[PDB]
Amino acid sequence: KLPNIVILATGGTIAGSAATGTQTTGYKAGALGVDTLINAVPEVKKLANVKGEQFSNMASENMTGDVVLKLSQRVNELLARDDVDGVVITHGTDTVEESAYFLHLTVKSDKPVVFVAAMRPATAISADGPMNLLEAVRVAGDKQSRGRGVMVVINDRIGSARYITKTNASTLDTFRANEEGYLGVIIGNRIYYQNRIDKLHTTRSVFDVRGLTSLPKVDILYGYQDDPEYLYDAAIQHGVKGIVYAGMGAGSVSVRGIAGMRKALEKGVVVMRSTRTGNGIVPPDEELPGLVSDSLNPAHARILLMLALTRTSDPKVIQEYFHTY
Amino acid sequence: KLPNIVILATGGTIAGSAATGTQTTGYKAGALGVDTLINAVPEVKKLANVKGEQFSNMASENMTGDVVLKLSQRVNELLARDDVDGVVITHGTDTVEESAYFLHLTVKSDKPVVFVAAMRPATAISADGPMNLLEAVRVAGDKQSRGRGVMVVINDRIGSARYITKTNASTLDTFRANEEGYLGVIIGNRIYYQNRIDKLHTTRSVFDVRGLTSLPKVDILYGYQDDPEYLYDAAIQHGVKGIVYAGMGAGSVSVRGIAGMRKALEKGVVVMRSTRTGNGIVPPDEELPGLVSDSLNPAHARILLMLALTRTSDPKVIQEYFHTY
Amino acid sequence: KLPNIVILATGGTIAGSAATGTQTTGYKAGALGVDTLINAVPEVKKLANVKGEQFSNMASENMTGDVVLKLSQRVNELLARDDVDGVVITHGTDTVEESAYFLHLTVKSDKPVVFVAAMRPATAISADGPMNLLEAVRVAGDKQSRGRGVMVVINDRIGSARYITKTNASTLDTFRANEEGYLGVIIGNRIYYQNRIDKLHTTRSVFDVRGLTSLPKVDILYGYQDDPEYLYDAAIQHGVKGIVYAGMGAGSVSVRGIAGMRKALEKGVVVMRSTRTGNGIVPPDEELPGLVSDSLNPAHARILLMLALTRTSDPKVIQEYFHTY
Amino acid sequence: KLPNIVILATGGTIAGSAATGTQTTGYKAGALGVDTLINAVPEVKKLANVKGEQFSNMASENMTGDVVLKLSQRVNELLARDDVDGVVITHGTDTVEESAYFLHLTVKSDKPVVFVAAMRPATAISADGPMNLLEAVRVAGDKQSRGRGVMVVINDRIGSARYITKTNASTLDTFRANEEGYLGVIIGNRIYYQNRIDKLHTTRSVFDVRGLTSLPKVDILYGYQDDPEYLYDAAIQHGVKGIVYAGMGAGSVSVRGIAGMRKALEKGVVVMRSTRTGNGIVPPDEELPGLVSDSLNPAHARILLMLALTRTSDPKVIQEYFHTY
């Protein structure tokens, strides 16, 4: 029989629309309901028994920790039922790497959780959303997909929430993991799996959102020539618990940045040095302040740091998380 | 006869050293002098008549607008003489894209200006520095190289200062221009040119640094879920003339970021929306505040914005610059 | 007023169809007529005055030199008229790099010649064909596009016929030029040009097809472990004028391949060593037999070799062509 | 205590040399002995107890199935001993993907088998071989490396024999797996593992070389415009058991190629359709003759087809191998 898939809608461009079919920019995201989306691709109903639920309807640049936290709890609830085999979450592309990674760390189930997005509005000529959604359901309902961590499906590719990121401001093929590749690809309606991530996630994660009602405050500061120190003062003075530094090269700091970090440290703020480059490993360096983000980019590093702080503030333990998650 | 090339040293990993040949991280950058570098690769002296000049010796994360401005003026002086055919600038990798792009816009000569860097210390096993320097001089002395804008040479590739960027925190092949490719490659001691950038630069640029002693203050703020508004207040309150926003997706802003931008606007601060993604075009959008950066990434966009402000503050003219430079 | 664009159809997947909207493989290419294509995207008629002409209707794997030669002559005729500003050629994806490069070398006009293809059948959910065609016409009608050589437009990118190639058997984003990047991109209905190829083409090419009725015979042989020598004998014995060798690494040959090449040489067959790798430069090597293909891949190298032979058989002159075209 | 690593040398550029340090092309591969290599990087002796064995000394374009078969048997012997923890095989770059994949399928051990190569001669300025060898030994001796299949280590990257391939004729960063990424990377002397391939290999493979003295004959034929049919006749007439077809796009065949394949089929020859593109999935198509290679490229597909024929000639079983290995 067909598997039972629930399609949780949060908004995004995949549900956006513009006045004309040639308008691919300046459209309104989160304008259509989940059912309109489902009826656009009726074929979806032959791959599984789908049920659409409207969790929200916004542009992903406005997604917040509060909402992501509730989204995570809602998905844990659904996955606990016996009449739910998998979940597909329609989301915006802009911050899908952030929400997808948060759930990658907090969903306590082996059942597939697949995020799907689209770079073109649903009203666009050659809109990518329909096929993306169709592929997402297919992946969600396949039993080969269990235990692979949270996945992002778009443009025939299946990426891990831990490595996948939006690398181009506006192309269809924007989502890639340059050094880590894709978990698999969907060609001709067959799924081809190629990798399994060698990291901890989902059912083997220590992070638990059941019981939380708010998350620690973590900001991201950029590293560049002449980077100001006052931005660190500002962050501290506003009660941030952690600071993710999108540094030059391999988390390199200027004299001004070092001053700001030392200050944040003597104030109890956790400093996580990452990179602005876009890919790669930020290796340990005792000569420099703060922890290092391993291969986590700024956006992902902020997510893992927020969660880590809901467990400990021990630098030694947090550094461990960053090398295993 | 051999061409006359001047090698201006500013420091960087290409002049760094560590206690052991297997230490590739945690070393000391800007530790060796230009002459030590020149003598390490004597072959260089058969490709041209070289003269080394020590401009500075620092880790590039500490390079500042002041030093870059003087560097730019120094290179204009040298290129004005008849006994100088080209210049090779040894620089750190971390902010080479910023310094190289600054000179790309302010050097008033058709003569080759080549930046060279290295990802491994000079004391490392398989240090890339020697061959990079050799290739740099070769490119600088070739007459085919005139009029191509400022170039960055490393790992057998020749990249435009306008497109090239450091994409990986720590690999040798870190420098790439995903959508724009390389101007050319150096294989087997022959130079293969393949592209000419379709942008304005050097001798056809309107920016002039002769006469300036300081640059406008421009900061970069990051875009992410829950991004704070107070960082905008902080920047404004510290007298920044412009703000480069490394936005989500195609320069998308959250409600908090929009508030902060509007505020900066009513305070006379120029707002330039760019992208944190790493590649791509941030297209115009009248629904949103600020200008758009075309394909300029945050680091490059800050450099062009600083220079534009030394000429005008007209949003219409600055937006033009961003589409032509 | 609107520019006059002619849309020459040759078949391909962009004109293919399958029984269901979810069938993306095993469909029938070259099934729809140019007018069906034009009417699918009416918006096209607001960008220019279009006239469709049905040149052929086949799957591109069956395109041959004869048909490409006639196609080239047909386009030269059309571009010679005053009421034609540009031409858009719908073609299959499989051998578009070969046909596009052939015309890149033989069309004697500065007017835009744009090839457009599609990876999904026209009857597919999220078919890429409509938007590709729309973008193609836009590029063809823009005056900024003159003198850039033949272009291939697909998936929002504009690639040079000389560098572009199909790198993936079946993804939408299959067309790339890893080392050379794209000439430009089309985002939000604006065209962003970034490069100009530094090679000879179109109006500055020495190759002329007016008057030819057939082309020299050139085959491609692969290089691998245990590659046989008898395939060279076979090719020679079948009257080939040239042999493009898709070699291991930088055009490396095994003892068996060297025997076969020497044999072909003493038989008057021109041997062009290329690479099977996919990208890069095959540098000169006097220790080995045959000419080297510069950065031309096997498919492109065969096209330039066929044309070169319609002019000379001088190894010295052909090698020159390969470094300038 | 230190692990016991054996370094089997087969030749290659990593052991090559040229008259000058600036000569990176036209050098002599397989010119130095394993001990010269070992003494060049003495640091290697602090990472493990190494023993060099000279299996051969040739340029990899001349490596053959016979030799690869013996190499595979020799490695199985060594890995069976208790005083051997891992093996590092120095090999040429040109056909390392072929030898590495052959062993990936026939080595019956969980112990690390690491292939290392180099793009620059050992006598070159900035030769990459030393650091590559150092990294290879480190990976071989780390216990985290067991059970990962055969690996190729070069340029700080660790790639799976199944996905890794040489993508550029002559750059240092030539080895990549565009869609599959790397198994891990080596930065700052620490190994960072990120993926585990989701394919069968080594101890879970059905292919056994113990007892074989020769391998089935398999050739590769290229697909392109005007591809001749006589090449198929030639292959058949020379007793090939299988034919790997490097086809256009997704294994597409011309009418001539179809004629040749049908002929090969009625003669008992197994036809495996692959792609010339360089990456991707060749999906099943009942409308076309022969089997499909999944994501295996021509070079890898030939290796798996040779081995498959040493077990069966059943099309249904061989097609299964191609989807699981």
Q: Which domains does chain D have, with CATH numbers?
A: 1-216 (3.40.50.1170), 217-325 (3.40.50.40)
C-alpha A253, offset from chain centre: 27
Residue D166 contacts C where some CB pair is shorter than 8 Å: yes
Q: How far is A174 from chain C (nearest CA, A)?
A: 10
Asked if C170 is an interface residue toward chain D (Cβ–Cβ < 8 A), one would say: yes
Burial of C143 (C-beta count, 10 Å sphere; 0-12/13-18/19+): exposed
The CA distance from C50 to D100, in Å, is 54
Q: Are C322 and C296 in contact (CB under 8 A)?
A: yes
Given an 8 Å threshold on Cβ–Cβ distance, is B280 in contact with C187?
A: yes
Q: What is the C-alpha separation between C273 and C265, in angstroms, rounded?
A: 13
Q: Are A29 and A12 in contact (CB under 8 A)?
A: yes
Helix axes D96-106, D65-80, angle to 10 degrees: 50
Give the DSSP letter string of B7-69: EEEEESGGG-B-SSTT--SS-BSS-S-HHHHHHH-GGGGGT-EEEEEEEEEE-GGG--HHHHH
| Interstrand relation of C151-154 and A184-187 (parallel, antiparallel or unpaired) | unpaired
Q: Exposure of A42 by Cβ count < 10 A (0-12 exposed, 13-18 middle, 19+ buried)?
A: exposed
Residue B99: its H or E element: helix B96-106
Work out the minimum CA distance from D167 to partner chain A, whole angstroms: 15
Cβ contacts of residue C121 below 8 Å, gap of 6+? C13, C16, C17, C18, C23, C24, C27, C29, C127
Compute the nearest-CA separation of D18 from chain B (Å): 12
Q: Do A298 and B277 touch (CB under 8 A)?
A: no
B147 touching C, CB under 8 A? no
Hey, are the CB atoms on A224 and B220 less than 8 Å from each other? Answer: yes
Sign for the pseudo-dihedral over CA of D192, D194, D197, D198: positive
The number of angstroms, rounded, from the C-alpha of D164 to the middle of its chain's C-alpha atoms is 8
A252 annotated as belonging to a binding site for a ligand: no
Strands B175-176 and B184-187: unpaired
Task: Tell the residue number behind the tokens 């050659």, with chain if given.
Answer: A126
User: By the 8 A CB rule, do C306 and C65 touch?
Assistant: yes
**Would the CB atoms of B98 and A224 count as touching at under 8 Å?**
yes
Q: Which phi-psi region, left, alpha or beta, contains residue C208 (left: φ > 0; alpha: ψ -120 to 50)?
A: beta
CA separation (Å) from B311 to A101, B272, C119? 44, 16, 48
The tokens for A176 are 């890639």
Q: Which residues in chain C have their CB less than 8 angstroms from residue D65's CB?
A: 225-226
β-strand partners of B292: B273
Which positions in chain B touch D130 (Cβ < 8 Å)?
Answer: 125-126
Among left, alpha and beta (phi > 0; psi -120 to 50; other), residue B190 is beta
What DSSP designation does D29 have? S
CA–CA gap between residue D294 and residue C279 (Å, rounded)? 22
> Pick from B125, B128, B129: which is nearest to D134 by CB?
B125
DSSP letter string, B141-210: H-GGGTTS--EEEETTEEEETTT-EE-SSS-TT-EE-TTT--SEEEETTEEEE-EEESS--GGG-----T
* Active site amino acids of B: 13
Other CB atoms closer than 10 Å to residue C47's CB: what's the count? 21
Contacts of C184 (CB under 8 A, 6+ apart): B198, C157, C158, C191, C192, C193, C194, C195
CB-count burial class (<10 Å; 0-12, 13-18, 19+) for D8 = buried
Q: Kindly state the helix (H) or strand (E) to which residue C245 belongs, with its residue range.
A: strand C242-247
Inter-chain touch B231–A228, beta carbons under 8 Å: no
Residues 46-75 of C with CB under 8 A from D: 59-65, 68
Q: Strand, helix or coil at B265?
A: helix
Q: Best residue in C22, C27, C186 to probe A by mutation, most A CBs within 10 Å?
A: C22
User: Which residue among A62, A280, A287 places its CB closest to the CB of B168?
Assistant: A280
Other C-beta atoms lying within 10 Å of the C-beta of residue B203: 12
Helices (H) and strands (E) in chain D, counts: 8, 15
Q: Is D90 on the interface with B (CB under 8 A)?
A: no
Interface test with C, best of D170, D225, D232 (most C CBs within 10 A): D225
Closest-CA distance, A196 to chain D, in angstroms, reads 5
Neighbours of A309 (CB within 10 A): 17
Taking the Cβ of residue D241 and every Cβ of chain A, the question of whether any pair is shorter than 8 Å is answered with no
d(CA A246, CA A243): 10
Q: What is the residue type of D76?
A: N
Q: Which residue of D has its CA nearest to C299?
A: D224
Q: Determine phi and psi for D168, rounding to 5 degrees.
A: -130, 140
Count of residues in chain B:
325
Considering only the beta carbons, identify the residue of A180, A193, A283 that sits closest to D188: A283
Q: How many of the other CB atoms lie within 10 Å of CB of C239? A: 9
Q: Tokens in use for B169? A: 């925190």
| 8-state DSSP, A178 | T
Whether A156 contacts A186, CB under 8 Å:
yes
Q: Name the resolution in angstroms.
A: 2.4
Is residue C13 annotated as a catalytic residue, yes or no? Answer: yes
The C-alpha atoms of residue D24 and residue D111 are separated, in whole angstroms, by 34
Q: Would an 8 Å CB–CB cutoff place D137 in contact with chain B?
A: no
* B60 annotated ligand binder: yes
Q: Which positions in chain B touch D22 (Cβ < 8 Å)?
A: 43, 134, 189
Question: Which of C13, C24, C123, C275 is the catalytic position?
Answer: C13
* Candidates D180, D187, D294; nearest CB to A181: D180
Angle (deg, nearest 10), helices D298-308 and D315-324: 130
Distance between CA atoms of residues A180 and A162, nearest Å: 10
Residues of chain B positioned with their CB less than 8 A from the CB of D124 = 131
Q: Could you say which of D180, D187, D283 has the minimum Cβ distance to residue A195?
A: D180
Q: In this structure, are residues B231 and A236 in contact, taking their beta carbons and an 8 Å threshold?
A: no
Nearest to residue C2, comparing CAs of C84, C96, C73, C74?
A: C84
The one-character DSSP state at A144 is G
Q: Does A192 touch chain B (CB under 8 A)?
A: no
> Taking Cα atoms as reference points, which of A126, A93, A288 lies closest to residue C136?
A126
Alpha helices in chain D (DSSP H): 34-40, 65-80, 96-106, 129-141, 230-236, 255-265, 298-308, 315-324
* E-state strands within chain A: 4-11, 49-58, 86-90, 113-116, 151-154, 157-160, 165-166, 175-176, 184-187, 190-193, 195-197, 218-222, 242-247, 270-275, 291-292
Instruction: Check CB contact under 8 Å for C283 and D170.
Output: yes
Partner residue facing C190 (CB), from B192, B196, B283: B283
What are the CA-CA distances from residue B240 to residues B221, B244, C306 (Å)? 12, 11, 61
- Rounded to the nearest angstrom, the minimum Cα separation between A301 and chain C is 29
Q: Do C230 and D238 touch (CB under 8 A)?
A: yes
**Closest CA in chain B for residue A252:** B61
Q: What are phi and psi of D157, to 5 degrees?
A: -110, 150
**H or E stretch covering B88:** strand B86-90
Instruction: Compute the distance between CA of residue A240 and CA of residue B226 in angstroms, rounded to an integer.
Output: 12
Which residues have a Cβ under 8 Å from the Cβ of D217 and sit 6 or more positions away?
C226, D238, D239, D240, D241, D242
Q: Of D51, D68, D60, D67, nearest to D29 (Cα)? A: D60
- C214 is written with which tokens? 């057939």
| Closest CA–CA distance from residue A289 to any residue of chain D (Å) | 18
Query: From CA A118, how far away is CA A133, in angstroms rounded?
Result: 9
Contact A280, A251 (CB under 8 A): no
Residue C266's Cβ-count burial label (10 Å; 0-12, 13-18, 19+) is: exposed
Q: Is B82 on the interface with A (CB under 8 A)?
A: no
B65-80 and B96-106 helices, crossing angle to 10°? 50
> Measured over all CA atoms, what is the biggest interatomic distance in chain B, rounded to whole angstroms?
64
Instruction: Give SS3 for B127.
Output: coil
C94 contacts in D (CB within 8 Å)?
Answer: 248-249, 252
Q: Helix crossing, B298-308 with B315-324: angle to 10°?
A: 130
Q: For residues B114 and B89, is the Cβ–Cβ distance under 8 A? A: yes
Contact A155 C171 (CB under 8 A): yes
Q: Which of D24, D125, D157 sits opposite B41 (nearest CB)?
A: D125
Return d(Cα B183, Cα B104) in angstroms, integer: 14
> Which residues in chain A are contacts of C189 at CB distance < 8 A?
22, 24
- Cβ contact (<8 Å) for C230 and D250? no
Q: Which stretches of chain D are assigned E, i.e. beta strand?
A: 4-11, 49-58, 86-90, 113-116, 151-154, 157-160, 165-166, 175-176, 184-187, 190-193, 195-197, 218-222, 242-247, 270-275, 291-292
B225 Cβ under 8 Å from any chain D Cβ: no
Residue D219 assigned as binding residue: no
Q: What is d(CA D239, CA B112) in angstroms, rounded to the nearest whole number?
A: 59
Chain A: residue whose CA lies nearest to C118: A126
Best A176, A186, A194, A324 member to test D by mutation, with max D CBs in 10 Å, is: A194
DSSP state of C162: T
Query: Phi and psi of A72, rounded to 5°?
Result: -60, -40
| Chains adjacent to A (≥3 CB pairs closer than 8 angstroms) | B, C, D
* CA quadruple B153, B158, B161, B164: dihedral sign: negative
CA C10 to chain B, closest CA, distance in angstroms equals 29
Of D182, D192, D198, the CB nearest to A194: D198
- Angle between helix B298-308 and helix B96-106 axes, rounded to 10 deg: 30
* Two tokens, residue D276: 């010339």
- Subunit contact B179:C181, Cβ cutoff 8 A: yes
- The number of residues making up chain D comes to 325
Residues of C in contact with B192 (CB under 8 A): 281, 294-295
